[PDB]
Design a protein around this ligand. Structure first.
Ligand SMILES: [Mg+2]
Ligand SMILES: [Mg+2]
Ligand SMILES: [Mg+2]
Ligand SMILES: [Mg+2]
Ligand SMILES: [Mg+2]
Ligand SMILES: [Mg+2]
Ligand SMILES: [Mg+2]
Ligand SMILES: [Mg+2]
Ligand SMILES: [Mg+2]
Ligand SMILES: [Mg+2]
Ligand SMILES: [Mg+2]
Ligand SMILES: [Mg+2]
Lengths: 63, 183, 109
RNA sequence: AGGUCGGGUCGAACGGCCUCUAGUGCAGAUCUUGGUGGUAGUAGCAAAUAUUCAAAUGAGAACUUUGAAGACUGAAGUGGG
């Protein structure tokens, strides 16, 4: 499928960039059915679409 | 309809064609001439080997400044290539002609490609942008391909003309004298 | 026909990537692993695990390891009959060091 | 100079002779318009560090999507307006 619009909606809904969204490759059919921001919010709530963690920039060496 | 110049039995023949195929005419001509006159299954197997780079299509006419290769040794040539797109189109047409032949009710094992010809389709043109603000052409040379596969028949005929003879009186006398002088 | 066998080998990638351009070392390592599996198992359909891809690309392009322990399992092919009835699958073998080990056939249980 | 017949193709008008008339005969003019070649499957498609693996879709995937990995722009950014 083509989940570009799903990733864009998920980024705009969660509030992070597209680099931090995780669309699981097993629920591709349900993500493809998800065509609205409400359905994207449901997928985020039940954990199909996950917000990845921040890549750390540790300040220990400079401290 | 109205194929090229063929000399075969249409009752023992099947045909296929493809017009306005966006494939290079110079490569399809060599791909056709490589299999012209071949048995059908042998030609198909050879085309799959060409696609898998085990054998090559010899380039006879449109071959200037192409590279040399060892796989031309089969054909006594030094210049050969692997025109994959032309092989795809040609083997698709071969499959269509085999389907037409088995629909006609032909033997399907005596089938050899008797006729196959390629000629130039109308060009499909684009533009090229060259230095100092010039425009040139960037055109594809597509192909009309057609082929006729026929059943391999037996010996053609015998019993040539009567060959009427005209002999002078002197020649007749010589023949009669020899027939008298011998037994 | 027979020979669904699975083994563990050690590929010396150093002598295979000697002289290769730095930005092609890891893709050439992938291609040489495919060629190695074709040499040993005779199979042209070689599938590498993404874990093996990570083990190759763990140190960038030009940081490919010298020796790599591989598990190659020649499997019976499936899926809408293809060209070949056999396909090879290459897993990485987690180990401390890939040095000193010889190839061993592993039992399937 | 040209004319005539036969064969093939084609489908709707055309010729001989006596005269009249002219926008009346092409190989050229770096001629005009249009078309087509050899060159030639040739020159080439090489700036901007870099891509790889699996799965899905599909007739078909180096290039599409997802995931993973590796990278880059490096806030006088390849970002946001
Ligand atoms: Mg030359
Ligand atoms: Mg050259
Ligand atoms: Mg240009
Ligand atoms: Mg300009
Ligand atoms: Mg060197
Ligand atoms: Mg009419
Ligand atoms: Mg005039
Ligand atoms: Mg002229
Ligand atoms: Mg003149
Ligand atoms: Mg001129
Ligand atoms: Mg070239
Ligand atoms: Mg250049």
């Amino acid at each position: 499928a083509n989940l570009r619009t799903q990733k864009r909606l998920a980024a705009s809904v969660v509030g992070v960039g597209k680099r931090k969204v995780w669309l699981d490759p097993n629920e591709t059919s349900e993500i493809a059915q998800a065509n609205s921001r409400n359905a994207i919010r449901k997928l985020v709530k039940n954990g199909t679409i996950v917000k990845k963690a921040v890549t750390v920039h540790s300040k220990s060496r400079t401290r | 309809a109205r194929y090229g110049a063929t000399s075969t039995n249409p009752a023992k023949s099947a045909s296929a064609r493809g017009s306005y195929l966006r494939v290079s005419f110079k490569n399809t001509r060599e791909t056709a001439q490589a299999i012209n006159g071949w048995e059908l299954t042998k030609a198909q197997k050879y085309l799959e080997q060409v696609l898998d780079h085990q054998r090559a299509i010899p380039f006879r006419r449109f071959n200037s400044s192409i590279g040399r290769t060892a796989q031309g040794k089969e054909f006594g040539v030094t210049k050969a290539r692997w025109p994959a797109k032309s092989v795809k189109f040609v083997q698709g047409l071969l499959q269509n002609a085999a389907a037409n032949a088995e629909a006609k009710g032909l033997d399907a094992t005596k089938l050899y490609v008797s006729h196959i010809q390629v000629n130039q389709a109308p060009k499909q043109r684009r533009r090229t942008y060259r230095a100092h603000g010039r425009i040139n052409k960037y055109e594809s040379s597509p192909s009309h391909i057609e082929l006729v596969v026929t059943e391999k028949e037996e010996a053609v005929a015998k019993a040539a003309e009567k060959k009427v003879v005209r002999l002078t009186s002197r020649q007749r006398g010589r023949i009669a004298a020899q027939k008298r002088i011998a037994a | 026909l027979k020979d669904v066998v699975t083994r563990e080998y050690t590929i010396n990638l150093h002598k295979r990537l000697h002289g290769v351009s730095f930005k092609k070392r890891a893709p050439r390592a992938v291609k040489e692993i495919k060629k190695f599996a074709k040499l040993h198992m005779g199979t042209d359909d070689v599938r590498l695990a993404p874990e093996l891809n990570q083990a190759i690309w763990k140190r960038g392009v030009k940081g490919v390891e010298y020796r790599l322990r591989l598990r190659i399992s020649r499997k019976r092919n499936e899926e809408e009959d293809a060209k070949n009835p056999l396909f090879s699958y290459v897993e990485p073998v987690l180990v401390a060091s890939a040095k000193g080990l010889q190839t061993v056939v592993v039992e399937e249980d």
